[PDB]
Amino acid sequence: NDLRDRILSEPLKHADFFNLKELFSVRSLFDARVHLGHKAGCRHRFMEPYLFGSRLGQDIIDLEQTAAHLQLALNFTAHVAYREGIILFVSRHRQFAHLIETTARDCGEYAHTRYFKGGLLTNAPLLLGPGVRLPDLIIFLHTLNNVFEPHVAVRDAAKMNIPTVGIVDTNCNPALITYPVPGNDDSPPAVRLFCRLFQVAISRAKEKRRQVEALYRLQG
Amino acid sequence: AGSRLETVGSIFSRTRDLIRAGVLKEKPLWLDIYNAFPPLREPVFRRPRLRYGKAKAAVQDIFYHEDRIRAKFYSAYGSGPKAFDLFNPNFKSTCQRFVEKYIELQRLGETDEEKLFVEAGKALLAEGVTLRRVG
Amino acid sequence: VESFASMLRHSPLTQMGPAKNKLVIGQIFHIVEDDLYIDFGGKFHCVCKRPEVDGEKYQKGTRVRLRLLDLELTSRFLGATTDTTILEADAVLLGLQES
């Protein structure tokens, strides 16, 4: 039991323990239309510090802070996937719902791209089952629903003390999101880039966990 | 059980002070990762108040010196013959070639705008492209 | 390393300037019985009606020529705090990659 704490305490002492810096860069985010946001009138008030400027009406999201936030988001999701944490990909957007279900299936994590029920996270012991384990991380691929209002889980996770990583556009509200990533969530390649980044992050985390357990079996 | 208050503080503070008081006997697995790699801004709740009075946004417009020549190109010739290909990252349009000729004709010691404009308009014929002046 | 402002100054969307009456090559990525979802590439996808001539030549993956009118359709109305975004762009169909 004393050596079990070593497996959980090892990755906490390193910054890039899973080597996620090679996954992306500012040029890898630029060609995916990530730096593009909505118009100037659709700008949320809490998006001003995360913006680079306005290119003839359309707001431009800076990519330096985008990558600086994405590094922390990928590190956190890789660490929670390493510590055997339940990860739920939530997104209410009727264009990439199938892509998100397939990404969560290839990741071995869980997905919610359908109509989020009322008491799902709060009234879980009555909505899901008698005793249910709530997800240890919620990754939001679209913060707003089809009504252009903040999602229900973005508030229910903050109510249930569940960490939330979220891709926020120029019209989103990151006040309650634990790890916001200022980028674009409306272009197909921009969505696919984030889905593949989180895919490779969970894959590398589970693989390094299996390797650490392989050496755990040889340490005794 | 826990703290279901969203507007009081952040999830990290609400999970830390509960264990500090001794009501949360089990530490969540994400708390060590939050203590190790905290985000840039603490996820505290802030109400989106409206902006009244003379107060405006803090963002600035994106404009370069090349736009002042792109406006002359789009005012005189309009859209270039080569249509825009937004998929190519290194795509160079006719207006970009025009401003590339303009920035060097500026370095060649010329100040007059007509002597910087119609000479680049004639230099574009050296490559073999067509220009349609919109009357 | 390359800065984001340096790549954005030389990005083609910066070279295009205003999106009014601009010739853009866009690729179709979805097909509806009468509507064609063309991806001109900027932010959104424009939905155009299949013309009468050469209507069978428009398939998924076909690249066509468009005259961009608006990058994103947003407008304000009575008692609205923000705009009502349509999540679409406005452009007309002219041809299919003449070459």
Partner: peptide
């Protein structure tokens, strides 16, 4: 230190205001 930063200049693409049918008439 950066040279490719946008400069605070006026809008070059400012389209001229539309006129009435009797603008600048008598």
């Amino acid at each position: 230190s950066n040279e490719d930063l946008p400069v605070p200049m006026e809008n070059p693409y400012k389209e001229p205001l539309k006129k009435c049918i009797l603008c600048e008439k008598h």
